[PDB]
Paper text:
To gain an understanding of the molecular basis of the destruction of S trimer by [name], structural investigations of the [name]-[name]-2 [name] in complex with [name] were carried out. A non-competing Fab and hACE2 that recognize the [name] beyond [name] binding sites were used to increase the molecular weight of this complex for pursuing a high resolution (up to 3.6 Å) structure by cryo-EM reconstruction. As revealed by competitive SPR analysis, [name] recognizes a cryptic epitope on the other side of the [name], adjacent to the hACE2-binding site. The [name] epitope is inaccessible in the prefusion S trimer (neither the open nor the closed RBDs), suggesting that [name] binding would facilitate conversion to the disassembly states, which explains its neutralization of [name]-[name]-2 via destruction of the prefusion S trimer. [name] uses both heavy and light chains, and five of six CDR loops for interaction with the [name]. The buried surface area on the epitope is 1057 Å2 and [name]-[name]-2 recognition by [name] is largely driven by hydrophobic interactions. The [name] epitope consists of 24 residues, primarily located in the β1 (residues 353–357), β5 (residues 449 and 452), β6 (residues 490 and 492) and the loop between β5 and β6 (residues 462–472 and 481–484). Among these, 11 residues (46%) are not conserved between [name]-[name]-2 and [name]-[name], explaining its specificity for [name]-[name]-2 for binding and neutralization. Notably, the residue 501, identified as a key mutation site in recently isolated [name]-[name]-2 variants (such as N501Y) and shown to substantially enhance interaction with hACE2, is not involved in the interactions with [name]. These results indicate that [name] has the potential to neutralize the recent more-contagious [name]-[name]-2 variants.
Author numbering:
A (entry chain H): 3 to 126
B (entry chain E): 333 to 526
C (entry chain A): 19 to 615
D (entry chain L): 2 to 113
Write the structure that this text describes.
Amino acid sequence: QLLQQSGAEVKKPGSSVKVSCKASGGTFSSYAISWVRQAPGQGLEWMGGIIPIIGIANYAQKFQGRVTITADKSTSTAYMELSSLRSEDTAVYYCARERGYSGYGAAYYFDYWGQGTLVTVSSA
Amino acid sequence: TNLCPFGEVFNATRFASVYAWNRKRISNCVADYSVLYNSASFSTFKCYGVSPTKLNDLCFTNVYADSFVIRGDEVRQIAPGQTGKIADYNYKLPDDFTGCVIAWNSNNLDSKVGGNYNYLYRLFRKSNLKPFERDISTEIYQAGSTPCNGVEGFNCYFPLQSYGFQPTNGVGYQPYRVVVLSFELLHAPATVCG
Amino acid sequence: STIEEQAKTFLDKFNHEAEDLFYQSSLASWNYNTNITEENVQNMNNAGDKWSAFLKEQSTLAQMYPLQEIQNLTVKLQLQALQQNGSSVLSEDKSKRLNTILNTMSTIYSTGKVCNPDNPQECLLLEPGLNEIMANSLDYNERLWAWESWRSEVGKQLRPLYEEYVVLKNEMARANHYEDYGDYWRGDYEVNGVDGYDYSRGQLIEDVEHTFEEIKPLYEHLHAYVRAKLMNAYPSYISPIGCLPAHLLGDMWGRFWTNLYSLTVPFGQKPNIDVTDAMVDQAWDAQRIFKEAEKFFVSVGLPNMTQGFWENSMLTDPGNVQKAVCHPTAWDLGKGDFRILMCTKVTMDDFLTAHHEMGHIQYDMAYAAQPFLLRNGANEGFHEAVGEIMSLSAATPKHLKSIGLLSPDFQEDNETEINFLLKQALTIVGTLPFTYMLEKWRWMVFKGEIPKDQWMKKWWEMKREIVGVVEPVPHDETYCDPASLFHVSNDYSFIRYYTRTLYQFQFQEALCQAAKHEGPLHKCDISNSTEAGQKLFNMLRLGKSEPWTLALENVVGAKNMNVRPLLNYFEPLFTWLKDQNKNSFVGWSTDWSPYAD
Amino acid sequence: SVLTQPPSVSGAPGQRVTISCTGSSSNIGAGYDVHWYQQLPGTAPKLLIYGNSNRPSGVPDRFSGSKSGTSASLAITGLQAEDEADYYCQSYDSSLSGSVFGGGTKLTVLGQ
Ligand SMILES: *[C@@H]1O[C@H](CO)[C@@H](O)[C@H](O)[C@H]1NC(C)=O
Ligand SMILES: *[C@@H]1O[C@H](CO)[C@@H](O)[C@H](O)[C@H]1NC(C)=O
Ligand SMILES: *[C@@H]1O[C@H](CO)[C@@H](O)[C@H](O)[C@H]1NC(C)=O
Ligand SMILES: *[C@@H]1O[C@H](CO)[C@@H](O)[C@H](O)[C@H]1NC(C)=O
Ligand SMILES: *[C@@H]1O[C@H](CO)[C@@H](O)[C@H](O)[C@H]1NC(C)=O
């Protein structure tokens, strides 16, 4: 009724996480669904975003080349195929939506964020 | 006592689309407009309310620099008192506009074979924009009386349509990057002189 | 809100989807026709069917808008071309049978062949096999065999197909509220709902039968003079008062008579105007032929070619490595990308087609401001007529002396002009009764005024009555002689070659009058006369947003097709042929046949 | 994080605290609008102050945002025990072509 998102992850460096984000609810195939990161104990960071009725994908200049964001509008689920980062990749990955009010100024998300997938990369 | 960074507005290889036209403030700097008008490779350079030579020795408090990518035929709609898909729906200039409008061809930068579908434009909107009003909403345009519930179909259209730029498109449809400057005055002390 | 403003919203969404998908359907069909590879066949049929299904996608979405509650005709003309559903109104049982027969009749035409009877392993295609026979041989029986064999091999194999072709395409059109499929073709010429400019679909039959009755003075002397010269070259075979044999008409069908210019020349020792040799001596390449054609349209004030015309078009045959379909076509890909795909040889013939196919490009550039369903000729006949008047104005000796291909000491006299107009009349006046015969034949087929046991019977009764051409071999109903042509077998409206002819001389006279020209009509160049260019451009910029009768009056001041500008053109030839026919019969008897012994 | 924001604030319950989001000439000073976010500990963050001075459906009237040039202010009146959270200002940035966040302030009430 809010959003669906896959469970917590533990990964090895060099492997790849494809963390899903199912239409927690409301409109999907007609809304920019972003991705916001938070390293544990650190500030938030935007990662990327798609408008899943076209397929445009903007990304940050930090996360460029590694993350790919896609969605299938038939299943109402986004995806966040991160390629590999070594050890500071461990961070909780929320899945925000995007409204985009008209006027002046720009994007606030929805309030709809995912419950938070904590993808931990480690060697132990 | 810094020079105003017009270059990092002009040397940027990623201009935003016209619906989410991109705003940078230019302030707290002495301004060198002399490299702009002396370039002489623009396909459109208009100033509206001030001569290009006189504005170099003229003091302003804030300079807003809009920058975006439109099509070649739609450069004419960036002018006070124009209409169209860009003036009404995407980027509206006021009638008392006091800035300069700068445009240059970028068929080469911003098109590629198969279509550079990255640059979007709001093809439908209910009401028209105010001056400098930005509409980044992806909300489905209800063309009819039946409510849409945010899906596409009969009288339910997505507003942000994409420019498909190939480099083989004609001169009227080649992507002309546009940087719209805007100047203002207040009771604040002038930060932009030259 | 209202049905009109939703349709203004729909067509605002339809255009910006159809600009992109028609561009990819053209840019891939470009890359096939420049470079014939099997990889490019796939991109031709991928993007071509993403467009062909997109019309079917947007035809069904457009029929939810009723035309009765639409007031703006520039919106209403867009939906009227879109809410028509074509063959998709049929059942998919009938639709897949129908698309089969079209690809069945095309392969019997395009890949069918005839074989000489003494050596059955070597055989003859139509192109360039039977075309080289029927245009260049002078033997009676070699042309007689090539006539019969293409109509016995390909003619039999299309007859049970063409029977079913009529029945399916009627129900294709009768479900479209058209009285037959002949009325489906005439719906391009239809104008509705503009007072003083309306034009019913049956008004066309009232015009095309009327305008042909006044070419019959010009044609029956042209039919008499050509028969008089071919009685001299075929003595035991052509009656002095009868009709012509069908195989002695310049090609397979008697469409054009241009190939009879050698046998029927007026003044056989006068030199024909041919600046092929002067283009070689001045060392012109195909780039120069198009720079002079550009400067022709700069002279009349029309805008010159875009920079993307020179960068992107095929103007020369690009070697022998890659193959291209070297038919000269003018490519509006949309979106400002205007191209001519032409394998130009440096001659005068590809100096005339140089101005012709650029005339289509000058036509297509003018209505790029129109929205997408209004980006066409105002009917099917203007588009090929705007290009052809640019080839008549370049073929004039005044124009060739202006650019240095014809010497300033060249003499214009009585005898070179009669050699010129008789070359035109075998091309232009000769194709008018054939085009009127064939489309009046189809319109009596599709309406059902001809029973199916009399298609071959009424055909040669129309030949002996309208055109004046008798068959040398009597044909039963086992043949399908019309479908031996390209346009009959492959589902094309052929009346666009009658009306285009009668428009180009309206376009020529009403711009020579705008050029303040003094003298006969065939001696008229339109060059340097921007008032004759701004007059034409006001028709060209409309597209089909205004009706074709209004765009025709924007040039000629008339609302209707008319042959009085045609007979004004060949008036020095019309007076000449009557003097030549002072000892020959004018007209033809319907009774004589070569198979009567 | 581009948007300069203090490490933490501290106040009394019943007091008024203000949280600064100072940007640059490309992100806040350029007329783009800030957005404030509430992260209760161990929770997914939510919409606090909508559209630089507005509210979403379901927030008390104690929170109010503003903007003055190249700054912002998350005005919180009458601190509560359920206001111990982390506060992130979001304002879109021009040169980055992406929506950048702020430094985050831990709100700590006093009394024990
Ligand atoms: C953009 O860079 C060029 C050199 O590449 C230089 O002129 C300047 O830094 C910038 N241009 C302007 C007009 O400031
Ligand atoms: C023609 O197509 C082939 C394969 O499709 C390609 O290798 C060749 O380069 C093309 N010709 C040109 C001139 O590009
Ligand atoms: C018809 O619609 C076009 C735009 O679609 C508009 O420019 C024109 O004025 C309309 N016609 C009339 C008579 O209002
Ligand atoms: C067409 O002619 C004008 C007028 O001389 C000229 O400015 C323009 O460059 C020409 N077009 C091209 C593609 O050269
Ligand atoms: C057109 O005008 C130009 C310049 O006046 C001249 O050189 C040319 O010969 C003229 N051509 C014709 C056909 O009048």
